[PDB]
């Protein structure tokens, strides 16, 4: 019951109250100084006055393409163990098994020996994926 | 949750004051002045018990020297002789003997004198 109900050993760490005497933590308590740190927190960015690393280092080159359609990546080894009987592989089926993000286009990698002779109804297969699928005896789609 | 922090503090106040009783003026009346004195008093007790032990050695030595001089012998040669005799007797009870039974002290002096070799050469 509740009177036998206990917290887990090692959890429920007591709050270290700070400004409660010298035996508990101290009068200055961490801020054992008289400078800025004693009275206020200096921004983590500020180095001292010299140019911080944020301006000292050069700007990361390049840009970012707005029209970049990122594809989700499906492990053919995961196909091998997930559907050892083959038969048919749908995207709805793969997400039903939780192997890939929902509502997204996919790609197939070839890292893993494929033995399951199964056609895959999906998108954008790699050349090595075609090598493994045709090795098993299946067919690529898009 | 206001807690009214009086009670917890009062435990300290009444404890320190009841221990501090007997001190003169603003020592046995004021908490914050008494507190100072307990710190000084107890640091003093801390070193004074040890100094006390040394002090008692000084007293015992003086008395042994007095009785020894009454038997025409110095403390130096007295202890040297007793060590040569193996008489592992402390200065507390030796000084006691000096009062309870001076004759026993004289006997120990004769033992030391006989045990001492001959002179100051080696």
């Amino acid at each position: 019951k509740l009177h036998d109900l206990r917290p887990a050993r090692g959890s429920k760490i007591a709050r270290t109250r700070v400004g409660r005497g010298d035996g508990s933590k101290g009068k200055t308590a961490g801020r054992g100084t008289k400078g800025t740190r004693a009275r206020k927190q200096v921004p983590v960015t500020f180095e001292g006055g010299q140019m911080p690393i944020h301006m000292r280092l050069p700007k990361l080159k390049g840009f970012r393409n707005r029209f970049r359609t990122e594809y989700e990546i499906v492990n053919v080894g995961d196909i091998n163990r997930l559907f050892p009987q083959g038969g048919a592989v749908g995207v709805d089926d793969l997400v039903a098994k939780g192997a890939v993000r929902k509502n997204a286009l996919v790609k197939v990698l070839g890292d893993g020996k494929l033995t399951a002779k199964v056609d895959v109804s999906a998108h954008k297969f790699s050349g090595s994926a075609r090598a493994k699928i045709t090795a098993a005896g299946g067919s690529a789609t898009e | 949750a206001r807690v009214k922090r009086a009670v917890n503090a009062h435990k300290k106040r009444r404890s320190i004051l009841k221990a501090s009783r007997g001190y003169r003026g603003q020592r046995s009346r004021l908490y914050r002045k008494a507190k100072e004195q307990q710190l000084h008093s107890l640091n003093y007790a801390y070193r004074d018990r040890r100094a006390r032990k040394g002090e008692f050695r000084k007293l015992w030595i003086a008395r042994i020297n007095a009785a020894a001089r009454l038997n025409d012998i110095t403390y130096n040669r007295l202890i040297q002789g007793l060590k040569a005799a193996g008489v592992e007797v402390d200065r507390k009870n030796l000084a006691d003997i000096a009062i309870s039974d001076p004759a026993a002290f004289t006997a120990l002096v004769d033992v030391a004198r006989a045990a001492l070799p001959e002179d100051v050469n080696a």
Partner: protein
């Protein structure tokens, strides 16, 4: 209410697929007549963050 990422850090540092951060070196945008190809090759490329400020940088990015 919600953390902010330092925009310069997001525009200068690039996190990799693991717990590593790299810094672009480019002390080569002003004068390039006196610098040898040795020096420009030392600057060319991308260099892991030295371990002497990662405890700061990771908080600057996050």
């Amino acid at each position: 209410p919600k953390a902010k990422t330092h925009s310069g850090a997001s525009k200068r540092f690039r996190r990799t697929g693991t717990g590593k951060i790299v810094r672009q070196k480019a002390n080569r945008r002003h004068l390039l007549e006196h610098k040898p190809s040795t020096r420009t090759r030392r600057l060319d490329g991308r260099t892991v963050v030295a371990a002497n400020d990662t405890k700061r940088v990771t908080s600057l990015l996050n």
